[PDB]
Amino acid sequence: TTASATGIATLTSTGDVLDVWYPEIGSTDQSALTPLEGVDEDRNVTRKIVTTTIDIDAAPTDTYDAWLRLHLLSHRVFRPHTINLDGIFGLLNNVVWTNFGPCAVDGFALTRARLSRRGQVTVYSVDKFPRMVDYVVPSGVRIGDADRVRLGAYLADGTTVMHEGFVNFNAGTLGASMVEGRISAGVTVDDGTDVGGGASIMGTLSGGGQHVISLGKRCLLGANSGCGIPLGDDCIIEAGLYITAGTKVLFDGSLHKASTLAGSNGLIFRRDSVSGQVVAVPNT
Amino acid sequence: TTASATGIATLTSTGDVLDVWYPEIGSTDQSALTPLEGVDEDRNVTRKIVTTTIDIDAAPTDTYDAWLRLHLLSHRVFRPHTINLDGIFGLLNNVVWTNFGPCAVDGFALTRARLSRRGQVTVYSVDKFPRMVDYVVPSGVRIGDADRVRLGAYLADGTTVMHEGFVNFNAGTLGASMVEGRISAGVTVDDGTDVGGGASIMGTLSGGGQHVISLGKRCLLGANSGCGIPLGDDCIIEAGLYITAGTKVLFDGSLHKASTLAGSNGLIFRRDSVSGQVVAVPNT
Amino acid sequence: TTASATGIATLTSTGDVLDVWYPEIGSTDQSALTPLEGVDEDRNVTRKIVTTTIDIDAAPTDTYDAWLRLHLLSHRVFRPHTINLDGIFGLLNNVVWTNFGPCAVDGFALTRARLSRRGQVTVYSVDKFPRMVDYVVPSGVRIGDADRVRLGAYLADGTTVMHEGFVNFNAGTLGASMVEGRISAGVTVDDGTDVGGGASIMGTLSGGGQHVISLGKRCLLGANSGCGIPLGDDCIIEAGLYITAGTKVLFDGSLHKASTLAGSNGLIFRRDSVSGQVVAVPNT
């Protein structure tokens, strides 16, 4: 699908793209942005209006195109998995995200020294993905510590991300959800889901499919729980319990790999003291 | 109990209250605050001195009264559960907390554009509760990442909140305590307690009482542990173990719901490899 | 070993040292820093160039010496455990880390009021250790939320610290590593290690040796796991499992304290549904 927008890019003297801000999508209005164009000699960058047009099904081909992809997600124009992001890591620069804006990692010590004549320099982050909220604040959301939501995160109207929640790029919520735990890249949860405090969805060593996971509607993951399998609607994972793809769970009298229960609806995963096993039992 | 204070409110052109700062409680001194009064045309708000008087036992009745309640907690004038907070969620506005101060969520894109003529705009948080430290820094405390303590948190002299700790409103510490994990709203811990790294107190799905919990003195919760029951003094929860209200624990030869041990003193909760159970054993 | 550097100190009118910045180590160039020297009457501090020389094997003896020690670590001049830090807690002041720089905890309310005539005051942290990145951005690293890396952290080239990672002082990575969990003071991990999301290394109640731990090369700790024992190379800890020094693990047909396996290479620690035990099995 064709998509396009007008934004303002921050460029180094090499022409490396540190960032592009697209305040809105599909718009032509350049002169909202003209008074931001210019040179910043302390940072050695220039800011320059650009117009970018892409095909969402093609892999991104340069840095401008990568940035527009992430804005399309966080503006909620497109959902996770409807935009091709292949190769995006090779298109984004590592940047020093400061109170004065993006700065190049090369020669930051000189930049810091020059900027310090204007004020205290604070570094928020050093990464290829900036903090979502500094580019897009989507409507109807709360974010308690906005360090923890990357540009490219999709947060549906009605979502709260608590301070210990985290939402990566190409990930997030498809309806109103309470996110107190960690949503890895590619993962989505649906309406009325509560990801409890410190819970992990698709974390390190949770799975071994060639393929990413999601949760359905009204799933409840307990605090400090984890989930490495796709779940359907109305599933519950007990506080403190990590269900990995390879966890053996007792369901109908025998042990089964949790991956065999992928996509189930209405299951409660919990520890069971009488059997000594993780059990999967029907939710009612 | 009657309480009162003089502060400065930030108001939108509708008269919605974005925030009130009360630098001190019970004071009359208006002209410390007069040079802050004014209009900010970029944000479209005005700042205006107010005096607010409340009864701590009555439910709050407007936004000013809500804000004073949260200041009374974080100034440590009153302890958690001695101030009525019923309805507070309906009195607080969702706000965009920026480096230029509070901004309205409605029309933030225009606000961001106007503010950007003065400097880089950074959004810290989008929420109904601001970061405590921007209103009150209570004496004798350390806070490693101050995104993680909400205004309304009560931190006793001698408390350290580590970077992965979190303290909600109406919650916190009643004596000198090390907080490396997460204290939900309504929860308090007492003197010499260590909430270990990533531990959860009263998290999502930890309990099913009609009622909130607390820990006593000198409780030690291991890293990545959890507790969904009130505990007395000198209790220990093993690292990595979540004790929910419904967890079956082996105590005196039989299995009991952990809720039956609510308020105990001197218990160690740990996994036991010879029984395959969570055991509760006497601390000595 | 003798070490020295030129920096700029922030001093209160008592001469208490709030911070020292040493932009580079072993250098004489004072006049890069002269235009920063001065008085800040709102904060009541002065900034003053200093030259500091220490012996890395001697305990630190004043505040300047403490600060240089932490810079030597985060500049990667010396590795964790090659600099004596005994007594450092008594040499560092508790500071209010603000957007205007370090401020004294004593009389902060007056400082906040004075600074507010220049702009919104934001408090980032209140602690004895500042945020590493505001003093040193080491080359070749990404840090998603830079609140979570203390000055004194050693991050090897090629390291990513994700937003829920944390690295204390005198701790970190000895080669390229993915840090998504929490590295306590004194702990190091080596090349190709992945500390999964929310994992804890040497957290509260994980151990009872008189002595700190480390992980070797290519160790994989699952999300929400924990480790309280030194491990060698190529070890794996299952997602959701905490291996404490006192955890009983099944290895060769009998139960052994995990501390007896300290320093092993090529072990996989996982829950085993058929035995009901934590097992340690060979990695291949």
CA distance C216 to C175: 10
Q: At a CB cut-off of 8 Å and minimum separation 6, what does A8 contact?
A: A20, A21, A33, A36, A37, A47, A48, A49, A50
Interchain contact, C121 vs B101, CB within 8 Å:
no
Residue whose token pair is 């004489």: C28
Interchain contact, B137 vs C126, CB within 8 Å:
yes
Choose the closest CB to B197 out of C117, C145, C203: C203
Of the candidates A95, B189, B6, A270, which has an alpha carbon nearest to the alpha carbon of residue C141? Answer: A95
Say if B109 is an interface residue toward chain A (CB within 8 Å).
yes
The domain defined by B1-91 folds into: Alpha-Beta Plaits (3.30.70)
Say if A254 is an interface residue toward chain C (CB within 8 Å).
no
Q: At a CB cut-off of 8 Å and minimum separation 6, what does C61 contact?
A: none
User: What are the b/e assignments for A15-29, b being 16+ CB within 10 Å?
Assistant: eebbbbbbbebeeee
SS3 state at C275: coil
| String of DSSP letters for C232-247 | -SS-EE-TT-EE-TT-
Choose the closest CB to A222 out of B112, B128, B205: B205
Q: At a CB cut-off of 8 Å and minimum separation 6, what does A7 contact?
A: A20, A21, A22, A23, A33, A49, A50, A51, A52, A67, A68, A71
Reduce the secondary structure of chain A to three states and give it as a string: CEEEEEEEEEEECCCCEEEEECCCCCCCCCCCCHHHCEEECCCCEEEEEEEEEEECCCCCCCHHHHHHHHHHHHCCCCCCCCCCCCCHHHCCCCEEEECCEEEECCCHHHHHHHHCCCCCCCEEEEECCCEHHHCCCCCCCEECCHHHEECCEEECCCCEECCCCEECCCEEECCCCEECCEECCCCEECCCCEECCCCEECCCCCCCCCCCCECCCCCEECCCCEECCCCCCCCEECCCCEECCCCEEEECCEEEEHHHHCCCCCEEEEEECCCCEEEEEECC
CATH number of B92-131: 3.30.60.70
CA distances from A32 to A19, A76, B113, C58, C88 (A): 18, 22, 8, 60, 52
CA distances from A126 to A109, A279, C247 (A): 14, 43, 38
Q: Which helix (H) or strand (E) holds C68?
A: helix C63-74
Amino acid occupying residue C99: N
Determine contact, residues A22/A7, Cβ cutoff 8 Å: yes
Determine contact, residues C92/C128, Cβ cutoff 8 Å: yes
Backbone angles phi, psi at A160, to 5 degrees: -115, 125
Of the candidates C219, C227, C225, C221, which has an alpha carbon nearest to the alpha carbon of residue C201? Answer: C227
Residue of B71, B164, B182 to mutate when probing chain C, most C C-beta within 10 A: B164
Domains A1-91 and A132-284 agree in fold: no
Of the candidates B257, B205, B268, which has an alpha carbon nearest to the alpha carbon of residue B232? Answer: B268
Provide the 8-state DSSP code for C224: T
Long-range contacts of B52-58 (CB under 8 A, 24+ apart): B52/B4, B52/B5, B52/B6, B52/B7, B52/B20, B52/B22, B53/B2, B53/B3, B53/B4, B54/B2, B54/B3, B54/B4, B55/B1, B55/B2, B55/B3, B56/B1, B56/B2, B56/B3, B56/B82, B56/B83, B56/B84, B57/B1, B57/B84, B58/B84
Contact residues, chain C, for A163 at CB < 8 Å = none
Q: What is the separation of C-alpha C136 from the centre of its chain, rounded to a whole number of angstroms? A: 13
CA distance A99 to B121: 8
CA distance B112 to A32: 12
Of the candidates B67, B127, B70, which has an alpha carbon nearest to the alpha carbon of residue B103? Answer: B127
CA distance C17 to C14: 9
Interchain contact, A148 vs C163, CB within 8 Å:
yes
CA distances from C202 to B243, C143, C181, C184, C244 (A): 21, 21, 11, 6, 9
Q: Tokens at residue C150, please?
A: 């203390």
Contact residues, chain B, for C276 at CB < 8 Å = 276
Say if B197 is an interface residue toward chain C (CB within 8 Å).
yes
Q: What is the separation of C-alpha A189 from the centre of its chain, rounded to a whole number of angstroms? A: 12
Residue whose token pair is 């993780």: A278
With 0-12 / 13-18 / 19 or more C-beta atoms within 10 angstroms meaning exposed / middle / buried, residue B132 is buried
Long-range contacts of C78-82 (CB under 8 A, 24+ apart): C78/C1, C78/C3, C79/C154, C79/C174, C79/C188, C80/C154, C80/C170, C80/C171, C80/C172, C80/C186, C80/C188, C81/C170, C81/C186, C81/C188, C82/C56
CA distance A60 to C190: 34
Query: Which residues make beta-bridge pairs with C202?
Result: none
Q: Count other C-beta atoms under 10 Å from residue B181's C-beta.
A: 33
CA distance B173 to B219: 12
| String of DSSP letters for chain B | -EEEEEEEEEEETT--EEEEE-SSSS----TTTGGG-EEETTTTEEEEEEEEEEETTSPP-SHHHHHHHHHHHHTTSS-TTSS--TTGGGTSPPEEEETTEEEESTTHHHHHHHHTTTS---EEEEESS-BGGGT---TT-EESSGGGBBTTEEE-TT-EE-TT-EE-TTEEESSS-EE-SEE-TT-EE-TT-EE-TT-EES-TTS--SSS--B--TT-EEPTT-EE-S---SS-EE-TT-EE-TT-EEEETTEEEEGGGGTT-SSEEEEEETTTTEEEEEE--
Say if B114 is an interface residue toward chain A (CB within 8 Å).
no
Choose the closest CB to A125 out of C144, C221, C274: C144
Say if C27 is an interface residue toward chain B (CB within 8 Å).
no
CA distance B65 to A84: 50
Chain B nearest-CA distance from C163, in A, is 11
Backbone angles phi, psi at C109, to 5 degrees: -60, -40
Q: What is the CA radius of gyration of chain A?
A: 21
Choose the closest CB to B223 out of C124, C203, C277: C203
Please report all neighbours of B, defined by 3+ CB atom pairs within 8 A: A, C
Amino acid occupying residue B24: E
Q: What is the CA radius of gyration of chain C?
A: 21
CA distance B96 to B45: 13
Q: Count other C-beta atoms under 10 Å from residue A122's C-beta.
A: 21
Say if C192 is an interface residue toward chain A (CB within 8 Å).
no
Active site (catalytic) residues of B: 180
Please report all neighbours of C, defined by 3+ CB atom pairs within 8 A: A, B
Residue boundaries of the structural domains of chain C: 1-91, 92-131, 132-284
Contact residues, chain B, for C150 at CB < 8 Å = 144
Please report all neighbours of A, defined by 3+ CB atom pairs within 8 A: B, C
Determine contact, residues C259/C245, Cβ cutoff 8 Å: yes
CA distance C147 to C127: 12
Interchain contact, C144 vs A147, CB within 8 Å:
yes
Contact residues, chain C, for B273 at CB < 8 Å = 248, 255, 277-278
* Closest chain A residue to the Cα of B226, Cα to Cα: A240
Q: Which helix (H) or strand (E) holds C195?
A: strand C194-195
Q: What is the CA radius of gyration of chain B?
A: 21
CA distance B55 to B36: 28
Q: Tokens at residue A17, please?
A: 């793209």
With 0-12 / 13-18 / 19 or more C-beta atoms within 10 angstroms meaning exposed / middle / buried, residue B152 is buried
Say if A205 is an interface residue toward chain C (CB within 8 Å).
yes
Interchain contact, B222 vs C244, CB within 8 Å:
yes
User: What are the b/e assignments for B61-93, b being 16+ CB within 10 Å?
Assistant: eebbbbbbbbbbbbbbbbebeebebeebeebbb
Chain C nearest-CA distance from B260, in A, is 25
Say if C134 is an interface residue toward chain A (CB within 8 Å).
yes
Cβ–Cβ pairs < 8 A, chains A and C: 121
Binding-site residues from annotation of B for Mg(2+):
147, 164
Give chain B's end-to-end CA distance (angstroms, integer).
42
Residue of A131, A145, A270 to mutate when probing chain B, most B C-beta within 10 A: A145
Max CA pair span of chain A: 71
**The dihedral of CA C36, C38, C43, C44: what is its sign?**
positive
Interchain contact, B197 vs C205, CB within 8 Å:
no
Contact residues, chain A, for C239 at CB < 8 Å = 200, 203-206, 226, 228, 242, 244
Q: Which helix (H) or strand (E) holds C161?
A: strand C160-161
Residue whose token pair is 């209140």: C126
SS3 state at C166: strand
SS3 state at C72: helix
Query: Which residues make beta-bridge pairs with B267?
Result: B282
Q: At a CB cut-off of 8 Å and minimum separation 6, what does A110 contact?
A: none
Chain C nearest-CA distance from A245, in A, is 11
Of the candidates A179, A155, A178, A176, which has an alpha carbon nearest to the alpha carbon of residue A165? Answer: A179
CA distance C87 to B225: 31
SS3 state at C231: coil
With 0-12 / 13-18 / 19 or more C-beta atoms within 10 angstroms meaning exposed / middle / buried, residue C19 is buried
Q: Is C223 annotated as a binding residue?
A: yes
Length of chain C: 284
| Way the structure was solved | X-ray
Cβ–Cβ pairs < 8 A, chains A and B: 121
Determine contact, residues B282/B268, Cβ cutoff 8 Å: yes
Choose the closest CB to B127 out of A99, A142, A225: A142
Interchain contact, A224 vs B242, CB within 8 Å:
yes
CA distance A18 to A27: 22
Query: Which residues make beta-bridge pairs with B51?
Result: B6
Binding-site residues from annotation of B for succinyl-CoA:
182, 197, 200, 223, 238-239, 246, 257, 270-273
CATH 3.40.50.10190 fits B132-284, yes or no: no
- How many CA within 13 A on the CB side of residue B21? 27
Determine contact, residues A180/A199, Cβ cutoff 8 Å: yes
